[PDB]
Every structure is written in structure tokens, then in C-alpha cells.
Amino acid sequence: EVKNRLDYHISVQNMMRQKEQEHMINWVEKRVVQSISAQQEKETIAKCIADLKLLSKK
Amino acid sequence: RKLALKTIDWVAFGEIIPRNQKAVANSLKSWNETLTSRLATLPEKPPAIDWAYYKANVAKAGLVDDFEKKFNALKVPIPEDKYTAQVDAEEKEDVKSCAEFLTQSKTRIQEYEKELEKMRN
């Protein structure tokens, strides 16, 4: 009868960390991903990996 | 306490007639067997807690620790009596059983034995 107690508190914080993690994931991703694209150099990196396709596809 | 070692001759048990109890005996046997089956099962020990594990892991914390010492510290009475006139409602009715009816009954028995002597003449 005692333990259910304790276990809830843990389970809450575990669930709370996941509902942070989801809200974090969505918000963090939704904040810091929009701005990135000013890198034309993410396409120099597309370019880079693409030369490592065009080269490294042999 | 532990277990009580009373052996019950169920043959003899139901038979009794202190008449307010003969019916009771018939019921009390079966009332017993209900209790008998119950105790004979019950798991002797329950578990206890890895306090250290939950001590970490409960983070409304110190709860497990508080509980740890307090649970390890928390103690328990042991369940009351009701009806233990039996120890006594025995021995006195036992004097009726045995001695009082015994001795009288032997007194009867002897006269026939003495008279079967006589009838041997």
C-alpha cells in the first residue's frame, strides 16, 4: 500500500520527462530547424556528399 | 505466535453433548476446516523493498528513505482473542467427562463384573 506511492512519483517523473521529451522534440525541432536553411552550404554539403557519390559511387 | 500443537481426534470430536455445544462441534469442525485450509496456505513471508533502488528512483524523494527506516521500524500487534474459554470449558467439563462420569460409570461397570462373578455361580 506504501509503495504504490513512491512508484507513482517516479512514474510521473518518467512520464513527465517523456512529455518534456516530446514537447522538447516538437518545439526544439520546430524552432531550431526553420532558420538553418540560409546555408547554401547545406547544399555545398549536398554538393560534398554528392561528390562523395559522383566519386564514391564506383 | 507459532503454531499450536493440538491433535484432534475428529471421531471423538463431534460427539460431545454438553448439549449447548454438540451442534457447535459439528459446525466448529467445519468452521475449523475453513480456518485450517486458510492458514495452511498463507504465504509465510511477504517481501520487502529495495530501499536503495527506490531511494534513487522516487524523486518526490526522501520518500523511499523516510519509508525505509519507518517501514523497517513500523511494527505490528498480533490479532486478539475471542472465545478462549475453551482451555477451561475443557478441563471442568473434563472433570465431568472423565472423573465424575468416569468414576460413576466404572462404579456401574464393576457391579455387573461382580455380578458376572456371581453369575459364574
mmCIF file with all atom_site columns, C-alpha atoms in Angstrom:
data_model
loop_
_atom_site.group_PDB
_atom_site.id
_atom_site.type_symbol
_atom_site.label_atom_id
_atom_site.label_alt_id
_atom_site.label_comp_id
_atom_site.label_asym_id
_atom_site.label_entity_id
_atom_site.label_seq_id
_atom_site.pdbx_PDB_ins_code
_atom_site.Cartn_x
_atom_site.Cartn_y
_atom_site.Cartn_z
_atom_site.occupancy
_atom_site.B_iso_or_equiv
_atom_site.pdbx_formal_charge
_atom_site.auth_seq_id
_atom_site.auth_comp_id
_atom_site.auth_asym_id
_atom_site.auth_atom_id
_atom_site.pdbx_PDB_model_num
ATOM 1   C CA . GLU A 1 1   ? 0.000   0.000   0.000   1.00 0.00 ? 1   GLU A CA 1
ATOM 2   C CA . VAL A 1 2   ? 3.035   2.170   0.789   1.00 0.00 ? 2   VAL A CA 1
ATOM 3   C CA . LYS A 1 3   ? 4.932   1.561   -2.380  1.00 0.00 ? 3   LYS A CA 1
ATOM 4   C CA . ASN A 1 4   ? 2.335   2.470   -4.974  1.00 0.00 ? 4   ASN A CA 1
ATOM 5   C CA . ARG A 1 5   ? 3.052   5.865   -3.765  1.00 0.00 ? 5   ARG A CA 1
ATOM 6   C CA . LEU A 1 6   ? 6.651   6.165   -4.362  1.00 0.00 ? 6   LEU A CA 1
ATOM 7   C CA . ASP A 1 7   ? 6.179   4.341   -7.620  1.00 0.00 ? 7   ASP A CA 1
ATOM 8   C CA . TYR A 1 8   ? 3.740   6.959   -8.851  1.00 0.00 ? 8   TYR A CA 1
ATOM 9   C CA . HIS A 1 9   ? 6.146   9.742   -8.172  1.00 0.00 ? 9   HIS A CA 1
ATOM 10  C CA . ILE A 1 10  ? 8.769   8.038   -10.212 1.00 0.00 ? 10  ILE A CA 1
ATOM 11  C CA . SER A 1 11  ? 6.422   7.018   -12.894 1.00 0.00 ? 11  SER A CA 1
ATOM 12  C CA . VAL A 1 12  ? 5.210   10.638  -13.088 1.00 0.00 ? 12  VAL A CA 1
ATOM 13  C CA . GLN A 1 13  ? 8.678   11.999  -13.462 1.00 0.00 ? 13  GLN A CA 1
ATOM 14  C CA . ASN A 1 14  ? 9.464   9.299   -16.041 1.00 0.00 ? 14  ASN A CA 1
ATOM 15  C CA . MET A 1 15  ? 6.256   10.138  -17.994 1.00 0.00 ? 15  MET A CA 1
ATOM 16  C CA . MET A 1 16  ? 6.902   13.878  -17.428 1.00 0.00 ? 16  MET A CA 1
ATOM 17  C CA . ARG A 1 17  ? 10.417  13.543  -18.887 1.00 0.00 ? 17  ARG A CA 1
ATOM 18  C CA . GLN A 1 18  ? 8.915   11.822  -21.964 1.00 0.00 ? 18  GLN A CA 1
ATOM 19  C CA . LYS A 1 19  ? 6.234   14.602  -22.234 1.00 0.00 ? 19  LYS A CA 1
ATOM 20  C CA . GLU A 1 20  ? 9.071   17.067  -21.960 1.00 0.00 ? 20  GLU A CA 1
ATOM 21  C CA . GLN A 1 21  ? 10.986  14.957  -24.424 1.00 0.00 ? 21  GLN A CA 1
ATOM 22  C CA . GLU A 1 22  ? 8.043   15.025  -26.934 1.00 0.00 ? 22  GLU A CA 1
ATOM 23  C CA . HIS A 1 23  ? 7.301   18.725  -26.362 1.00 0.00 ? 23  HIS A CA 1
ATOM 24  C CA . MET A 1 24  ? 11.050  19.420  -26.489 1.00 0.00 ? 24  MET A CA 1
ATOM 25  C CA . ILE A 1 25  ? 11.379  17.312  -29.596 1.00 0.00 ? 25  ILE A CA 1
ATOM 26  C CA . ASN A 1 26  ? 8.493   19.019  -31.406 1.00 0.00 ? 26  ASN A CA 1
ATOM 27  C CA . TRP A 1 27  ? 9.347   22.550  -30.181 1.00 0.00 ? 27  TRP A CA 1
ATOM 28  C CA . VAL A 1 28  ? 13.102  22.290  -30.326 1.00 0.00 ? 28  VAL A CA 1
ATOM 29  C CA . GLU A 1 29  ? 12.858  20.825  -33.791 1.00 0.00 ? 29  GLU A CA 1
ATOM 30  C CA . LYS A 1 30  ? 10.167  23.363  -34.790 1.00 0.00 ? 30  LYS A CA 1
ATOM 31  C CA . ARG A 1 31  ? 12.235  26.337  -33.503 1.00 0.00 ? 31  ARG A CA 1
ATOM 32  C CA . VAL A 1 32  ? 15.827  25.382  -34.476 1.00 0.00 ? 32  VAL A CA 1
ATOM 33  C CA . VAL A 1 33  ? 15.213  23.930  -37.780 1.00 0.00 ? 33  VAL A CA 1
ATOM 34  C CA . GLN A 1 34  ? 13.312  26.730  -39.579 1.00 0.00 ? 34  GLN A CA 1
ATOM 35  C CA . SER A 1 35  ? 16.214  29.196  -39.669 1.00 0.00 ? 35  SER A CA 1
ATOM 36  C CA . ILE A 1 36  ? 19.001  26.746  -40.745 1.00 0.00 ? 36  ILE A CA 1
ATOM 37  C CA . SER A 1 37  ? 18.348  26.873  -44.449 1.00 0.00 ? 37  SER A CA 1
ATOM 38  C CA . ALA A 1 38  ? 20.395  30.081  -45.016 1.00 0.00 ? 38  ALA A CA 1
ATOM 39  C CA . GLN A 1 39  ? 23.194  27.553  -45.562 1.00 0.00 ? 39  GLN A CA 1
ATOM 40  C CA . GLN A 1 40  ? 23.544  27.331  -49.252 1.00 0.00 ? 40  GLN A CA 1
ATOM 41  C CA . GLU A 1 41  ? 26.415  25.326  -47.738 1.00 0.00 ? 41  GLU A CA 1
ATOM 42  C CA . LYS A 1 42  ? 23.879  22.553  -46.754 1.00 0.00 ? 42  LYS A CA 1
ATOM 43  C CA . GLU A 1 43  ? 23.751  22.109  -50.327 1.00 0.00 ? 43  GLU A CA 1
ATOM 44  C CA . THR A 1 44  ? 27.567  22.578  -50.615 1.00 0.00 ? 44  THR A CA 1
ATOM 45  C CA . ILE A 1 45  ? 27.249  19.620  -48.152 1.00 0.00 ? 45  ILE A CA 1
ATOM 46  C CA . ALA A 1 46  ? 24.769  18.146  -50.667 1.00 0.00 ? 46  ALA A CA 1
ATOM 47  C CA . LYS A 1 47  ? 27.382  19.005  -53.250 1.00 0.00 ? 47  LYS A CA 1
ATOM 48  C CA . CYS A 1 48  ? 30.066  17.430  -50.817 1.00 0.00 ? 48  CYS A CA 1
ATOM 49  C CA . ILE A 1 49  ? 28.305  14.125  -50.272 1.00 0.00 ? 49  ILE A CA 1
ATOM 50  C CA . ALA A 1 50  ? 27.285  14.288  -53.979 1.00 0.00 ? 50  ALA A CA 1
ATOM 51  C CA . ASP A 1 51  ? 30.949  14.477  -54.999 1.00 0.00 ? 51  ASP A CA 1
ATOM 52  C CA . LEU A 1 52  ? 31.277  11.576  -52.494 1.00 0.00 ? 52  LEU A CA 1
ATOM 53  C CA . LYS A 1 53  ? 28.535  9.938   -54.621 1.00 0.00 ? 53  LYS A CA 1
ATOM 54  C CA . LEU A 1 54  ? 29.800  11.002  -58.043 1.00 0.00 ? 54  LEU A CA 1
ATOM 55  C CA . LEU A 1 55  ? 33.293  9.975   -56.871 1.00 0.00 ? 55  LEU A CA 1
ATOM 56  C CA . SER A 1 56  ? 32.402  7.391   -54.138 1.00 0.00 ? 56  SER A CA 1
ATOM 57  C CA . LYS A 1 57  ? 29.763  5.517   -56.181 1.00 0.00 ? 57  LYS A CA 1
ATOM 58  C CA . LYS A 1 58  ? 32.404  3.407   -58.007 1.00 0.00 ? 58  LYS A CA 1
ATOM 59  C CA . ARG B 2 1   ? 2.744   -16.939 17.893  1.00 0.00 ? 1   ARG B CA 1
ATOM 60  C CA . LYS B 2 2   ? 3.783   -20.058 16.029  1.00 0.00 ? 2   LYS B CA 1
ATOM 61  C CA . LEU B 2 3   ? 1.523   -22.971 15.676  1.00 0.00 ? 3   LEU B CA 1
ATOM 62  C CA . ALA B 2 4   ? -0.318  -24.726 18.486  1.00 0.00 ? 4   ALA B CA 1
ATOM 63  C CA . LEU B 2 5   ? 0.137   -28.435 18.658  1.00 0.00 ? 5   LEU B CA 1
ATOM 64  C CA . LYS B 2 6   ? -3.240  -29.888 19.446  1.00 0.00 ? 6   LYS B CA 1
ATOM 65  C CA . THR B 2 7   ? -4.078  -33.120 17.712  1.00 0.00 ? 7   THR B CA 1
ATOM 66  C CA . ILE B 2 8   ? -7.713  -33.606 17.014  1.00 0.00 ? 8   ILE B CA 1
ATOM 67  C CA . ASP B 2 9   ? -9.429  -36.975 17.135  1.00 0.00 ? 9   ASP B CA 1
ATOM 68  C CA . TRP B 2 10  ? -12.295 -35.980 14.894  1.00 0.00 ? 10  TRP B CA 1
ATOM 69  C CA . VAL B 2 11  ? -14.069 -39.292 15.730  1.00 0.00 ? 11  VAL B CA 1
ATOM 70  C CA . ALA B 2 12  ? -14.380 -38.278 19.277  1.00 0.00 ? 12  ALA B CA 1
ATOM 71  C CA . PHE B 2 13  ? -14.753 -34.507 18.453  1.00 0.00 ? 13  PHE B CA 1
ATOM 72  C CA . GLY B 2 14  ? -18.316 -34.116 17.171  1.00 0.00 ? 14  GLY B CA 1
ATOM 73  C CA . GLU B 2 15  ? -19.843 -36.448 19.702  1.00 0.00 ? 15  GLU B CA 1
ATOM 74  C CA . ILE B 2 16  ? -19.868 -34.323 22.682  1.00 0.00 ? 16  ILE B CA 1
ATOM 75  C CA . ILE B 2 17  ? -23.150 -33.292 24.264  1.00 0.00 ? 17  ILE B CA 1
ATOM 76  C CA . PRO B 2 18  ? -22.616 -30.540 26.752  1.00 0.00 ? 18  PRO B CA 1
ATOM 77  C CA . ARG B 2 19  ? -25.675 -30.058 24.859  1.00 0.00 ? 19  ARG B CA 1
ATOM 78  C CA . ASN B 2 20  ? -25.237 -26.316 24.069  1.00 0.00 ? 20  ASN B CA 1
ATOM 79  C CA . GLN B 2 21  ? -22.082 -27.344 22.077  1.00 0.00 ? 21  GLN B CA 1
ATOM 80  C CA . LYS B 2 22  ? -22.768 -30.672 20.291  1.00 0.00 ? 22  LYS B CA 1
ATOM 81  C CA . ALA B 2 23  ? -24.350 -28.760 17.372  1.00 0.00 ? 23  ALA B CA 1
ATOM 82  C CA . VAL B 2 24  ? -21.494 -26.235 17.763  1.00 0.00 ? 24  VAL B CA 1
ATOM 83  C CA . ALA B 2 25  ? -18.926 -29.066 17.453  1.00 0.00 ? 25  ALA B CA 1
ATOM 84  C CA . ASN B 2 26  ? -20.440 -30.255 14.134  1.00 0.00 ? 26  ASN B CA 1
ATOM 85  C CA . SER B 2 27  ? -20.261 -26.629 12.859  1.00 0.00 ? 27  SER B CA 1
ATOM 86  C CA . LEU B 2 28  ? -16.925 -25.821 14.651  1.00 0.00 ? 28  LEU B CA 1
ATOM 87  C CA . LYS B 2 29  ? -15.151 -28.726 12.881  1.00 0.00 ? 29  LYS B CA 1
ATOM 88  C CA . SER B 2 30  ? -16.146 -27.261 9.517   1.00 0.00 ? 30  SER B CA 1
ATOM 89  C CA . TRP B 2 31  ? -15.517 -23.755 10.742  1.00 0.00 ? 31  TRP B CA 1
ATOM 90  C CA . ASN B 2 32  ? -12.090 -25.186 11.631  1.00 0.00 ? 32  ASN B CA 1
ATOM 91  C CA . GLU B 2 33  ? -11.518 -26.727 8.241   1.00 0.00 ? 33  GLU B CA 1
ATOM 92  C CA . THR B 2 34  ? -12.168 -23.351 6.617   1.00 0.00 ? 34  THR B CA 1
ATOM 93  C CA . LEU B 2 35  ? -9.577  -21.795 9.038   1.00 0.00 ? 35  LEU B CA 1
ATOM 94  C CA . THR B 2 36  ? -7.294  -24.903 8.609   1.00 0.00 ? 36  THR B CA 1
ATOM 95  C CA . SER B 2 37  ? -7.192  -24.668 4.796   1.00 0.00 ? 37  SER B CA 1
ATOM 96  C CA . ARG B 2 38  ? -6.726  -20.885 5.081   1.00 0.00 ? 38  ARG B CA 1
ATOM 97  C CA . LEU B 2 39  ? -3.707  -20.795 7.380   1.00 0.00 ? 39  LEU B CA 1
ATOM 98  C CA . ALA B 2 40  ? -2.089  -23.857 5.873   1.00 0.00 ? 40  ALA B CA 1
ATOM 99  C CA . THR B 2 41  ? -1.758  -21.869 2.648   1.00 0.00 ? 41  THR B CA 1
ATOM 100 C CA . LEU B 2 42  ? -0.955  -18.296 3.581   1.00 0.00 ? 42  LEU B CA 1
ATOM 101 C CA . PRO B 2 43  ? 2.491   -17.379 2.342   1.00 0.00 ? 43  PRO B CA 1
ATOM 102 C CA . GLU B 2 44  ? 4.714   -17.095 5.410   1.00 0.00 ? 44  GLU B CA 1
ATOM 103 C CA . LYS B 2 45  ? 6.673   -14.047 4.428   1.00 0.00 ? 45  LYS B CA 1
ATOM 104 C CA . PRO B 2 46  ? 5.826   -11.106 2.254   1.00 0.00 ? 46  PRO B CA 1
ATOM 105 C CA . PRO B 2 47  ? 8.624   -9.330  0.550   1.00 0.00 ? 47  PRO B CA 1
ATOM 106 C CA . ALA B 2 48  ? 10.298  -6.103  1.423   1.00 0.00 ? 48  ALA B CA 1
ATOM 107 C CA . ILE B 2 49  ? 11.814  -3.279  -0.606  1.00 0.00 ? 49  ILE B CA 1
ATOM 108 C CA . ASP B 2 50  ? 14.954  -2.424  -2.198  1.00 0.00 ? 50  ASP B CA 1
ATOM 109 C CA . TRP B 2 51  ? 15.020  0.900   -0.460  1.00 0.00 ? 51  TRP B CA 1
ATOM 110 C CA . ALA B 2 52  ? 18.291  1.995   -2.177  1.00 0.00 ? 52  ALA B CA 1
ATOM 111 C CA . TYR B 2 53  ? 16.720  1.378   -5.627  1.00 0.00 ? 53  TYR B CA 1
ATOM 112 C CA . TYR B 2 54  ? 13.638  3.431   -4.968  1.00 0.00 ? 54  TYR B CA 1
ATOM 113 C CA . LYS B 2 55  ? 15.715  5.891   -2.839  1.00 0.00 ? 55  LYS B CA 1
ATOM 114 C CA . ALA B 2 56  ? 17.349  6.884   -6.070  1.00 0.00 ? 56  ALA B CA 1
ATOM 115 C CA . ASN B 2 57  ? 14.382  6.460   -8.188  1.00 0.00 ? 57  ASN B CA 1
ATOM 116 C CA . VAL B 2 58  ? 11.486  8.309   -6.307  1.00 0.00 ? 58  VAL B CA 1
ATOM 117 C CA . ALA B 2 59  ? 12.066  11.883  -6.921  1.00 0.00 ? 59  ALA B CA 1
ATOM 118 C CA . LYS B 2 60  ? 9.469   13.325  -4.718  1.00 0.00 ? 60  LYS B CA 1
ATOM 119 C CA . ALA B 2 61  ? 12.497  11.979  -2.918  1.00 0.00 ? 61  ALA B CA 1
ATOM 120 C CA . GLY B 2 62  ? 13.497  11.020  0.578   1.00 0.00 ? 62  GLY B CA 1
ATOM 121 C CA . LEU B 2 63  ? 10.013  9.366   0.436   1.00 0.00 ? 63  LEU B CA 1
ATOM 122 C CA . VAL B 2 64  ? 11.568  5.902   -0.020  1.00 0.00 ? 64  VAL B CA 1
ATOM 123 C CA . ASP B 2 65  ? 14.228  6.639   2.610   1.00 0.00 ? 65  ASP B CA 1
ATOM 124 C CA . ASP B 2 66  ? 11.638  8.041   5.095   1.00 0.00 ? 66  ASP B CA 1
ATOM 125 C CA . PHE B 2 67  ? 9.564   4.991   4.304   1.00 0.00 ? 67  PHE B CA 1
ATOM 126 C CA . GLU B 2 68  ? 12.654  2.805   4.503   1.00 0.00 ? 68  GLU B CA 1
ATOM 127 C CA . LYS B 2 69  ? 13.620  3.465   8.028   1.00 0.00 ? 69  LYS B CA 1
ATOM 128 C CA . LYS B 2 70  ? 9.945   3.931   9.029   1.00 0.00 ? 70  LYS B CA 1
ATOM 129 C CA . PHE B 2 71  ? 8.742   0.673   7.398   1.00 0.00 ? 71  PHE B CA 1
ATOM 130 C CA . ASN B 2 72  ? 11.754  -1.222  8.723   1.00 0.00 ? 72  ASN B CA 1
ATOM 131 C CA . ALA B 2 73  ? 10.771  0.455   12.061  1.00 0.00 ? 73  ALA B CA 1
ATOM 132 C CA . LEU B 2 74  ? 6.974   0.066   11.812  1.00 0.00 ? 74  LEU B CA 1
ATOM 133 C CA . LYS B 2 75  ? 5.548   -2.742  13.913  1.00 0.00 ? 75  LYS B CA 1
ATOM 134 C CA . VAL B 2 76  ? 2.505   -4.668  14.420  1.00 0.00 ? 76  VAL B CA 1
ATOM 135 C CA . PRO B 2 77  ? 0.289   -6.010  17.153  1.00 0.00 ? 77  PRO B CA 1
ATOM 136 C CA . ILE B 2 78  ? -0.873  -9.650  16.931  1.00 0.00 ? 78  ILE B CA 1
ATOM 137 C CA . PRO B 2 79  ? -4.702  -10.369 16.440  1.00 0.00 ? 79  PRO B CA 1
ATOM 138 C CA . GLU B 2 80  ? -6.943  -10.544 19.571  1.00 0.00 ? 80  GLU B CA 1
ATOM 139 C CA . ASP B 2 81  ? -8.582  -13.387 21.365  1.00 0.00 ? 81  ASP B CA 1
ATOM 140 C CA . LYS B 2 82  ? -12.232 -14.079 21.413  1.00 0.00 ? 82  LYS B CA 1
ATOM 141 C CA . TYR B 2 83  ? -13.500 -17.324 22.782  1.00 0.00 ? 83  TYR B CA 1
ATOM 142 C CA . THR B 2 84  ? -10.639 -18.880 24.749  1.00 0.00 ? 84  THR B CA 1
ATOM 143 C CA . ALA B 2 85  ? -12.948 -20.241 27.385  1.00 0.00 ? 85  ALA B CA 1
ATOM 144 C CA . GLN B 2 86  ? -12.054 -23.491 25.619  1.00 0.00 ? 86  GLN B CA 1
ATOM 145 C CA . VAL B 2 87  ? -8.876  -24.109 27.927  1.00 0.00 ? 87  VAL B CA 1
ATOM 146 C CA . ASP B 2 88  ? -11.133 -24.031 30.861  1.00 0.00 ? 88  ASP B CA 1
ATOM 147 C CA . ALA B 2 89  ? -14.572 -25.003 29.345  1.00 0.00 ? 89  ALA B CA 1
ATOM 148 C CA . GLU B 2 90  ? -12.471 -28.006 28.769  1.00 0.00 ? 90  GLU B CA 1
ATOM 149 C CA . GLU B 2 91  ? -10.990 -29.150 31.944  1.00 0.00 ? 91  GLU B CA 1
ATOM 150 C CA . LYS B 2 92  ? -14.046 -28.632 34.149  1.00 0.00 ? 92  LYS B CA 1
ATOM 151 C CA . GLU B 2 93  ? -16.395 -30.213 31.632  1.00 0.00 ? 93  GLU B CA 1
ATOM 152 C CA . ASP B 2 94  ? -13.330 -32.704 31.522  1.00 0.00 ? 94  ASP B CA 1
ATOM 153 C CA . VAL B 2 95  ? -13.850 -33.483 35.148  1.00 0.00 ? 95  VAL B CA 1
ATOM 154 C CA . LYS B 2 96  ? -17.492 -34.189 34.118  1.00 0.00 ? 96  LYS B CA 1
ATOM 155 C CA . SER B 2 97  ? -16.193 -36.200 31.041  1.00 0.00 ? 97  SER B CA 1
ATOM 156 C CA . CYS B 2 98  ? -13.576 -38.123 32.728  1.00 0.00 ? 98  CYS B CA 1
ATOM 157 C CA . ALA B 2 99  ? -13.634 -38.218 36.500  1.00 0.00 ? 99  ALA B CA 1
ATOM 158 C CA . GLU B 2 100 ? -17.267 -37.529 37.510  1.00 0.00 ? 100 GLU B CA 1
ATOM 159 C CA . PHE B 2 101 ? -18.903 -39.666 34.822  1.00 0.00 ? 101 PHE B CA 1
ATOM 160 C CA . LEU B 2 102 ? -15.870 -41.937 34.581  1.00 0.00 ? 102 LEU B CA 1
ATOM 161 C CA . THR B 2 103 ? -15.824 -42.936 38.200  1.00 0.00 ? 103 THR B CA 1
ATOM 162 C CA . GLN B 2 104 ? -19.628 -43.333 38.435  1.00 0.00 ? 104 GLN B CA 1
ATOM 163 C CA . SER B 2 105 ? -19.506 -45.335 35.132  1.00 0.00 ? 105 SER B CA 1
ATOM 164 C CA . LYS B 2 106 ? -16.751 -47.578 36.480  1.00 0.00 ? 106 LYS B CA 1
ATOM 165 C CA . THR B 2 107 ? -18.887 -47.966 39.619  1.00 0.00 ? 107 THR B CA 1
ATOM 166 C CA . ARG B 2 108 ? -21.692 -49.276 37.355  1.00 0.00 ? 108 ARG B CA 1
ATOM 167 C CA . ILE B 2 109 ? -19.239 -51.387 35.387  1.00 0.00 ? 109 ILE B CA 1
ATOM 168 C CA . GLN B 2 110 ? -17.895 -53.118 38.471  1.00 0.00 ? 110 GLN B CA 1
ATOM 169 C CA . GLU B 2 111 ? -21.336 -54.229 39.785  1.00 0.00 ? 111 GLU B CA 1
ATOM 170 C CA . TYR B 2 112 ? -22.012 -56.069 36.581  1.00 0.00 ? 112 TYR B CA 1
ATOM 171 C CA . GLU B 2 113 ? -18.479 -57.637 36.816  1.00 0.00 ? 113 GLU B CA 1
ATOM 172 C CA . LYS B 2 114 ? -19.011 -58.655 40.380  1.00 0.00 ? 114 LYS B CA 1
ATOM 173 C CA . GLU B 2 115 ? -22.427 -59.906 39.380  1.00 0.00 ? 115 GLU B CA 1
ATOM 174 C CA . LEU B 2 116 ? -20.892 -61.877 36.399  1.00 0.00 ? 116 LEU B CA 1
ATOM 175 C CA . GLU B 2 117 ? -18.694 -63.422 39.017  1.00 0.00 ? 117 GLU B CA 1
ATOM 176 C CA . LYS B 2 118 ? -21.995 -64.240 40.778  1.00 0.00 ? 118 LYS B CA 1
ATOM 177 C CA . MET B 2 119 ? -23.412 -65.477 37.563  1.00 0.00 ? 119 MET B CA 1
ATOM 178 C CA . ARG B 2 120 ? -20.303 -67.649 37.181  1.00 0.00 ? 120 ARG B CA 1
ATOM 179 C CA . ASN B 2 121 ? -22.055 -69.335 40.161  1.00 0.00 ? 121 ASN B CA 1
#
